[PDB]
A paper describes a structure:
Transglutaminase 3 (TG3), the autoantigen of dermatitis herpetiformis (DH), is a calcium dependent enzyme that targets glutamine residues in polypeptides for either transamidation or deamidation modifications. TG3, like all human transglutaminase enzymes, has a four-domain structure with an N-terminal β-sandwich domain, two C-terminal β-barrel domains (C1C2) and a catalytic core domain that harbours a catalytic triad with Cys, His and Asp residues. TG3 is unique among transglutaminases in the requirement for proteolytic cleavage between the core domain and C1C2 to become catalytically active. Here, we report four X-ray crystal structures representing inactive and active conformations of human TG3 in complex with a TG3-specific Fab fragment of a DH patient derived antibody.
To investigate the effect of calcium on the structure of TG3, we added 10 mM EDTA to strip Ca2+ from cleaved TG3, mixed with Fab DH63-B02 as before, and grew crystals. Most notably, the His301 – Glu359 dyad is disrupted. This is enabled by the absence of Ca2+ in site 1 which frees Asn225 to form an H-bond with the carbonyl of Pro357, causing the Pro residue to flip by 180 degrees compared to the Ca2+ bound forms of TG3. In Ca2+ binding site 3, the lack of Ca2+ leads to a rearrangement of the loop containing Asp325 so that Ser324 can form an H-bond with Gly527 of the C1 domain. Other amino acid residues are kept in a similar position as in the structures with Ca2+, but many of the H-bonds between the catalytic domain and the C1C2 domain are tighter in the structure lacking calcium. Specifically, 10/17 H-bonds are tighter in the Ca2+-stripped enzyme compared to the cleaved TG3, while 14/17 are tighter in the Ca2+-stripped enzyme compared to the zymogen. Taken together, these observations suggest that the interactions between the catalytic domain and the C1C2 domains are weakened upon binding of Ca2+ and the enzymatic cleavage. In the structure without Ca2+, Ser416 is peptide-plane flipped allowing the neighbouring His417 to form an H-bond to Glu449.
Numbering used by the authors:
A (entry chain A): 2 to 460, 475 to 693
B (entry chain B): 1 to 224
C (entry chain C): 1 to 216
């Protein structure tokens, strides 16, 4: 009898439960680094006293002992340093063995083999493979997160909420992160194998996967495709031919599957929250605690001015220059880890933003940027801090440009307009947690001023009191199909009567400020006595905005006002029209492996038919993949009632998400929390 | 619903050209890859060509590279297949199909047209030659014996066959035709008879080929 | 590239469940989505599964799909078989350029007794040899289900060149028949010891043989 292995029992279910990886829909062994796992190995005899056993684990195509991507270890007393295997018991020919990886092991798929030295002879057999993840339960892991409820929210929750809209109207969409769905973990690992860092130098790339700063950076870079290799094709054009409207996605699952199955070819099309939701799946799946952050009025300053410019003409059109300097909202991610590169005070939440691309400066993403560091203006620290600081801190400079004379002049500088209502989902609920005070000191504080100057450090001319002030107000209900009713309020603050000319326009836009089409314009001249206040009505019919309104449902309203011998005043507001309501109802108790009938309700509010009607539904633990249901054309003002079944696989509170689309309403959303009984 | 209407198929001689068209309705044409897929009679589905939604990525089966060209016209909602250098093995029903996938470079055919038929033959109209399939010289005189007619090398379809001017129908089966690499059709007809009828009852197949206006009779006789 | 290999045929009785597999020859079955199509006689194909296991709007819930990484295969499973499910079924996938179809599987929903084919192989007639041609004719009848494979052999040599075969079709007694042909020159005919027609039905192979030097 020369010593050899007969079987190995990996005790997969037990180890996954101990490792907090039991929720993944997978039969693989999935472990977290730095933590032991127990296997039973059946040999052909008891251990001979001359003989030797070594385990070998390796990851990646060029594994190296000096790079920590290969390790060779005997049965021993154990180890801090590295990998170790402890013989816990021998029972006949069966060995109870506790194997452990270091807290600094690279994540990813590993192979394990066993090399047996016996009778001046050596055997070797492949034992199997496993996946190794970051370990936010382990206090020596860089991703350690100590609080149980936060760890559950930020690693283990597969349903999410992303805040959208504007500073005037904060809404939300549901997002199915779906990191436990079939093949999603494996696809998120594949992101790392598809990076340019991997193709160029796989040995270095794999060895680098021990560092969450590196993994987060590579992951964030891959989501918004900057070549033909990333996950999503970005598109803020309003025109989504060849693809899906970015607003029609409800989760990361469909995206990541389509990516993989297409040969890792970009999925068409995403915008910033689509990237953030997808990046969030990847991070949580690999064990980096993470969450989605929305910033309102988010500035795009690549110039390190800490200021952006927006251009108008005297006729009250937004111009293309700077029309997207300040996004109504912009969504990114935070991940949770220490920053060994920065030091003890810069640990915790780190900004990771898949959206940015500046090829001229080699930026395929931003971060990780210590939020602590952003807030103190330590913008010399790695990575992408000047851009991130600016996103939440920039000044807004408004310019007039007159195409007839080619003259440009600075109208106003406005501080405190950018970086507002910075929002993320609360732990354990759908509430909006405001985290503005994490990125910034309080508005118009000494600290705020110190931080801004500090940061600025590391990176006519007169001032008017105009006679006339203005404000755009909404009258009544903003909804697609209904007319838009606004009023421009002007008030004369000077000691004398003034005559003001007002030129006004209204442009459909994408939420970042991409201008689509003029749909309405007006002008007015009026005299106002001192303190007089006047109202000019703005009415935009359905027929006027319908042809150019995008899934954003947004319209940019501008009024440039001018009294003789005074600087212009620019009054502006981006409005959001509500979709018609789409309702979901569960018609009986949700229980695991029992059919649950669900009802969609929709009333067409248009006096025309809506056609090409599709209802799309998904929800982790409720449906496998997604349901797409062809809905009959609705006539004018007609209602629709669609019944469908889900079939829950997992108990607890789950999230059902529904998209209804037709020719006139590209992406109406609905969501339901459903409590699923066991 | 989605409609795909194919046209341009017909009879053409080897070496020459056809151009197929497919006009689509009932979806956004420019959202989807489109494909030609073909099926030779009695055979499987063979993909011919794909064109991407934006016309900028094309693929061809190896069997057609060099010879066929796919294109599409957005304004006409149409897809085209230019088929040069035709060979009789290109004979097939040619389906236009819409790709299922929106916004990824995966492929599958969610809607198929009814197809346009392409037949590649250099044949002229031609009456068949009829050859006997003589019953086994070894046949139990208390069992049964197969005999038949091979109806060879006719064009175009169809042929019909009777036995004993339609007096014999019990045990008769006339098979579907095969199109040969020659571009001519053949079929057979068989009748299973009492082994003991052989060499007393007469067996004649009557072969009718309306396109050549020919009826051919063939007496089929036991061999030794 | 790769090929997709399906069984030539499968049968089951009404109400029962059947599974049809589709094996990918290289690369993982799970790398690319798998679709399934139903094709009835005289009709264009229609899609019954897309994206491995999703059911198109209006396909019944008796149709499901799955992937088995163990065997590198996809499967279509039809529960509660009805007579109308009898059809040809094709799987399909792609690499990032090319679309691949499997060979197709005939699904018989059993409604008569299984019945082994009767096979007769006819040598070339003297009339045909006199016209300087030769055709071996292999006629196959009275079988059910209506699915067969036919192979030809000339001495030690499997033969495909000059072979044409018909798809099975219904006889007037409700069973099936098929025909196969081998065209050869009279020299080829006379220069082999023997030729065989081999017919496989429901996993059993019958062989018929003729020779230029023997009465048959």
């Amino acid at each position: 009898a020369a010593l050899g292995v007969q079987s190995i029992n990996w005790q997969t279910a037990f180890n996954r439960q101990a490792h907090h990886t039991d929720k993944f829909s997978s039969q693989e062994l999935i472990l977290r680094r730095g933590q032991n796992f127990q296997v039973l190995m059946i040999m052909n005899k008891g251990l001979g006293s001359n003989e030797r056993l070594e385990f070998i684990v390796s990851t990646g195509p060029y594994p190296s002992e000096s790079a920590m991507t290969k390790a060779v270890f005997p049965l021993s007393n154990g180890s801090s340093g590295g990998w170790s295997a402890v013989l816990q018991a021998s029972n006949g020919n069966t060995l109870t063995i506790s194997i452990s990886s270091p807290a600094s092991a690279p994540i990813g798929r590993y192979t394990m083999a066993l090399q047996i030295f016996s009778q001046g002879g050596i055997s070797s057999v492949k034992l199997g493979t496993f996946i190794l993840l970051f370990n936010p339960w382990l206090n020596v892991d860089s991703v350690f997160m100590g609080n149980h409820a936060e760890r559950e929210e930020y690693v283990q929750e597969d349903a999410g909420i992303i805040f959208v809209g504007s500073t005037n109207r904060i809404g939300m969409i549901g997002w199915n992160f779906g990191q436990f769905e079939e093949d999603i973990l494996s696809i998120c690992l594949s992101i790392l194998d598809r990076s340019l860092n991997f193709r160029r130098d796989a040995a270095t790339d794999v060895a680098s996967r021990n560092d969450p700063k590196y993994v987060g950076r590579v992951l964030s870079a891959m989501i918004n495709s900057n070549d033909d290799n990333g996950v999503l094709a970005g598109n803020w054009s309003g025109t989504y031919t060849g693809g899906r409207d970015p607003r029609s996605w409800n989760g990361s699952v469909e995206i990541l599957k389509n990516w993989k199955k297409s040969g890792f070819s970009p999925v068409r099309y995403g915008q910033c929250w689509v990237f953030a939701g997808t990046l969030n799946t990847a991070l949580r799946s690999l064990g980096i605690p993470s969450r989605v952050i929305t910033n309102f009025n988010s500035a795009h300053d690549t110039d390190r001015n800490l200021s952006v410019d927006v251009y108008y003409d005297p006729m009250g059109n937004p111009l293309d220059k700077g029309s997207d300097s300040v996004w109504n909202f912009h969504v990114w991610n935070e991940g949770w880890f220490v920053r060994s590169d920065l030091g003890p005070s810069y640990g915790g939440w780190q900004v990771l933003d898949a959206t940015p691309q500046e090829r001229s400066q080699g930026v395929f993403q931003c971060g990780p940027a210590s939020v602590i560091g952003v807030r103190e203006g330590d913008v010399q620290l790695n990575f992408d801090m000047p851009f991130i600081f600016a996103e939440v801190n920039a000044d807004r400079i408004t310019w007039l440009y007159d195409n007839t004379t080619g003259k440009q002049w600075k109208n106003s500088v406005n501080s405190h307009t950018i970086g507002r209502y910075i929002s993320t989902k609360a732990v354990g609920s759908n509430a909006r947690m405001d985290v503005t005070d994490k990125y910034k000191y309080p508005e118009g504080s000494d600290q705020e001023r110190q931080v801004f100057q500090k940061a600025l450090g590391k990176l006519e001319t007169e001032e008017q009191e105009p006679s006339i002030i203005g404000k755009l107000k909404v009258a009544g209900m903003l909804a697609v199909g209904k007319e838009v009713n606004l009023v421009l309020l002007l008030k004369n603050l000077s000691r004398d009567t003034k005559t003001v000319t007002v030129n006004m326009t209204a442009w459909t836009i994408i939420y970042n400020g991409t201008l689509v089409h003029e749909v309405w314009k007006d002008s007015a001249t009026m005299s106002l006595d001192p303190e007089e206040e006047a109202e000019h009505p703005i009415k935009i019919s359905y027929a006027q905005y319908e042809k150019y309104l995008k899934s954003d449902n947004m319209i940019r309203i501008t009024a440039v006002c001018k009294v003789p011998d005074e600087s212009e005043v620019v009054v502006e507001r981006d409005i959001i029209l509500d979709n018609p309501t789409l309702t979901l109802e569960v018609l009986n108790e949700a229980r695991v492996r029992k059919p649950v009938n669900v009802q969609m309700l929709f009333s067409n509010p248009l006096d025309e038919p809506v056609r090409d009607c599709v209802l799309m539904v998904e929800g982790s633990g409720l449906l496998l993949g997604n349901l797409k249901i062809d809905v009959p054309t609705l006539g004018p003002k007609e209602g629709s009632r669609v019944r469908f079944d889900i079939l829950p696989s997992r108990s607890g509170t789950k999230q059902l998400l529904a998209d209804f689309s037709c020719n006139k309403f590209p992406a109406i959303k609905a969501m339901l929390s459903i409590d699923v009984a066991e | 619903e989605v409609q795909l209407v194919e046209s341009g198929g017909g009879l053409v001689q080897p070496g020459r050209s056809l151009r197929l068209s497919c006009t689509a309705s009932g979806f956004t044409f420019d959202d989807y890859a489109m494909h030609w897929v073909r099926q030779a009679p009695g055979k499987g589905l063979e993909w011919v060509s794909r064109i991407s939604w934006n016309s900028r990525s094309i693929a061809y089966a190896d069997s057609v590279k060099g010879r066929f060209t796919i294109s599409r016209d957005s304004a006409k909602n149409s897809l085209y297949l230019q088929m040069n250098s035709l060979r009789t093995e290109d004979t097939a029903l040619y389906y236009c199909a819409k790709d299922h996938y929106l916004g990824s470079d995966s492929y599958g055919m969610d809607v198929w047209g009814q197809g346009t038929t392409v037949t590649v033959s250099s044949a002229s109209t031609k009456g068949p030659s009829v050859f006997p399939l003589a019953p086994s010289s070894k046949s139990t005189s208390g069992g049964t014996a197969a005999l038949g007619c091979l109806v060879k090398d006719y064009f175009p379809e169809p042929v019909t066959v009777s036995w004993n001017s339609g007096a014999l129908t019990s045990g008769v089966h006339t098979f579907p035709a095969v199109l040969q690499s020659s571009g001519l059709y053949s079929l057979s007809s068989v009748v299973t008879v009492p082994s003991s009828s052989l060499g007393t009852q007469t067996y004649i197949c009557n072969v009718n080929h309306k396109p050549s206006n020919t009826k051919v009779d063939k007496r089929v006789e036991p061999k030794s | 590239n790769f090929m997709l290999t399906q069984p030539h045929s499968v049968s089951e009785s009404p109400g029962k469940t059947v599974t049809i597999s589709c094996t990918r020859s290289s690369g993982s079955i799970d790398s690319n989505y798998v679709q399934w199509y139903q094709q009835r006689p005289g009709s264009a194909p229609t899609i019954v599964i897309h994206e491995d296991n999703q059911r198109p709007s209006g396909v019944p819930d008796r149709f499901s799909g799955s992937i088995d990484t163990s065997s590198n295969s996809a499967s279509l499973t039809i529960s509660g078989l009805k007579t109308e499910d009898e059809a040809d079924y094709y799987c399909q996938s792609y690499d990032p350029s090319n679309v691949v179809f499997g060979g197709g599987t005939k699904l018989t929903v059993l409604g008569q007794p299984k019945a082994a084919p009767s096979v007769t192989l006819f040598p070339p007639s003297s009339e045909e040899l006199q016209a300087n041609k030769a055709t071996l004719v292999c006629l196959i009848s009275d079988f059910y289900p209506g699915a067969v494979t036919v192979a030809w052999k000339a001495d030690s040599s499997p033969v495909k060149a000059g072979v044409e075969t018909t798809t099975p079709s219904k006889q007037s007694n409700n069973k099936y028949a098929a025909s196969s042909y081998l065209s050869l020159t009279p020299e080829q005919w006379k220069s082999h010891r023997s030729y065989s027609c081999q017919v496989t039905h429901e996993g059993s192979t019958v062989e018929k043989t003729v020779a230029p030097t023997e009465c048959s």
